[PDB]
């Protein structure tokens, strides 16, 4: 039916994290029809209301039986991948059955059920330690921790597939929910009178609406396949993001090494993003910092507060 | 220097030639199999080697393994790979069992743990001969898994070797080119070379090292296991058509490779040579000829053991 000419029935799995509800939140007042798969393991299931448009299974991507019936059941014309294992590092029997499995799953049964689009998202850890920041889309992917390598081979997976797949390598994504990184840490414990610290590493940062526009164009038919870097392009240190923090709350921090696992400079170039998809990013580093804190501000450092009525 | 060695999937090729080596040593071994692609005849019930019928994908098996033989060396040789539509099964060999063997190695505090891995792993190199420390890169169902199966292990606190291998021939190896061209020439049927190069390894060389990166105190990390030089398949059909005597009816085509059909992949073993002490004796001649000369004792076969039976 509605939206006119593009209705959408679109399986999230993931769909109850910050990103998977994020995508909900913009694409159910559209009129797409959505079905979530989550277990919970770190999503909430208070950003799941009963309303009209969307439904949910609480289940697993490693359950190929339930991914079937839910594929069978559903029929989807368009799949979101965001279903990842990551909470704890020493469980790589979690990590490969969610990512690695559980994409195996999602891959072979959009197959089958013959979707038009599938997407998927990729974490910078798949580039390891690079050589070249800002990170070129060719680079050699490298990841040395579980979700890493359990995440690498999920995306690997989901390249040979037949269905026509986007795999977006993302920068760290602000916007509604997101509740944990520096972002929320330097708001809180500034507010508190407690002593931060900084990392001496550089990191980007992206505006959920430009994520949302990017997850847009990325199941239109007919446009580009294939990996993708998401981003501005531009890195900017802790202590850069410690600076507007400070500011906006209106209160000397240490900036340290380095940690062991801790890559020191993650941006990504996404220039063939600019290319094929005609996307550049438009909210800048001060206003992506500010808008998360802004929200902040209005609904506290939480991960439930549903914008659905 | 006596061993307790558990090797998954010793039922195999390169399991198998490990156990006739290391059998007659006194070293005491346990065979998990699943017999996918390895045979039963090639493990008799002799004094010395137990076998346990199961997957590495169990976790409750495996556990149940190490606990009653406590092993104090590990071979990890079991992997999947002949559906390459089949990625669920390459994913639960290759990865997740992967992962139970590092964890079950780790819990028993193993001295050594020893991998395999497939020059698949680096994918399309951009430099050949391939260079230990260039990126892997794979684009198939079994690259994909073994790559990320290794880098798993690589994360373990035991002691990890994963050897990149060229092409190991030697005892029942019944698969690829040699093969091929010594059963199709002596029937007389048409051969086809694709325009390839690869590196070949004889089994002598491969027990060698394995040897050494069992030893205490030895290097760890990974390593490609090669002579270092490369032969296309049209000098491997030379080899076998001059051992096997035949007259051609025509030239043998050559044929340009596939879209998935890696041009030249031959390793380069310099860092394994550096650290080790360790290098290939057999050249590519001697490695290609001692094949074929197995294959005219025995056949093509990967049903004969080397063990005596009582
Ligand atoms: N948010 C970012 O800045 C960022 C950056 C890089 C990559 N990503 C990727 O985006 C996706 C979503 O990330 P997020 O930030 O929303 O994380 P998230 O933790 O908020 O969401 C992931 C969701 O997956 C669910 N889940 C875990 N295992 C599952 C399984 N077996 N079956 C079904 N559901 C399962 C969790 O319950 C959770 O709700 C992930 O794939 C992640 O790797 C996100
Ligand atoms: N032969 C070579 O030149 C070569 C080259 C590169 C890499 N390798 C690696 O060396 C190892 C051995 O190779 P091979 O040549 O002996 O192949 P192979 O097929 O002869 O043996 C693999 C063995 O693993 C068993 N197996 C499969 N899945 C299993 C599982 N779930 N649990 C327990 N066992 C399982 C099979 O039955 C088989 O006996 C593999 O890891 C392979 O990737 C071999
Ligand atoms: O209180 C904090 C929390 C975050 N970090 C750093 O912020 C970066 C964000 O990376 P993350 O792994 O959190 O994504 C990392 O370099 C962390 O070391 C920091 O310096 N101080
Ligand atoms: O009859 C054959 C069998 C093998 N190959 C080639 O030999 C190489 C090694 O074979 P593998 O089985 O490893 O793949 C590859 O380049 C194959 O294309 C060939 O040209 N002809």
Redesign the interface.
């Known amino acids: 039916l509605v939206p006119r000419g593009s209705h959408m029935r679109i399986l999230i799995t993931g769909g109850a994290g910050c990103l998977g509800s994020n995508l909900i939140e913009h694409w159910l007042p559209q009129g797409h029809e959505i079905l979530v798969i989550d277990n919970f393991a770190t999503g909430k299931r208070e950003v799941l209301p009963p309303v009209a448009g969307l439904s949910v299974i609480e289940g697993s991507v490693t359950d190929?039986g339930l991914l079937e019936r839910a594929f069978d059941s559903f029929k989807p014309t368009h799949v979101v991948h965001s279903a990842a294992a990551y909470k704890d590092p020493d469980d790589?029997?979690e990590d490969?059955?969610t990512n690695?499995?559980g994409s195996?799953?999602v891959?072979?049964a959009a197959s089958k059920a013959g979707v038009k689009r599938l997407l998927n998202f990729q974490t910078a850890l798949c580039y390891g330690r690079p050589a070249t920041v800002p990170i070129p889309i060719d680079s050699?992917?490298?990841?040395?921790?579980?979700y890493g390598?359990?995440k690498?081979?999920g995306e690997?997976?989901l390249?040979?597939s037949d269905v026509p797949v986007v795999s977006l390598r993302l920068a760290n994504v602000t916007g509604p929910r997101l509740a944990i990184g520096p972002i929320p840490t330097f708001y809180k414990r500034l507010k508190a009178g407690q002593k931060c610290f900084c990392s001496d590493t550089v990191r980007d940062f992206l505006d959920m609406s430009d994520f949302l526009a990017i997850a847009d164009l990325s199941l239109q038919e007919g446009r580009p396949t294939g990996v993708f870097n998401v981003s501005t392009g531009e890195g900017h240190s802790i202590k850069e993001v410690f600076d507007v923090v400070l500011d906006y709350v209106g209160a000397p921090v240490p900036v340290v090494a380095p940690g062991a696992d801790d890559v020191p400079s993650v941006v990504l170039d996404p220039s063939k993003t600019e290319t094929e998809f005609g996307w550049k990013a438009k909210v800048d580093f001060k206003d992506t910092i500010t808008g998360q804190l802004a929200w902040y501000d209005k609904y506290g450092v939480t991960d439930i507060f549903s914008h659905l009525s």
């Open positions: 190929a790589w029997a490969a059955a690695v499995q195996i799953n891959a072979k050699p992917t490298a990841p040395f921790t579980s390598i359990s690498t081979a690997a997976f390249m040979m």
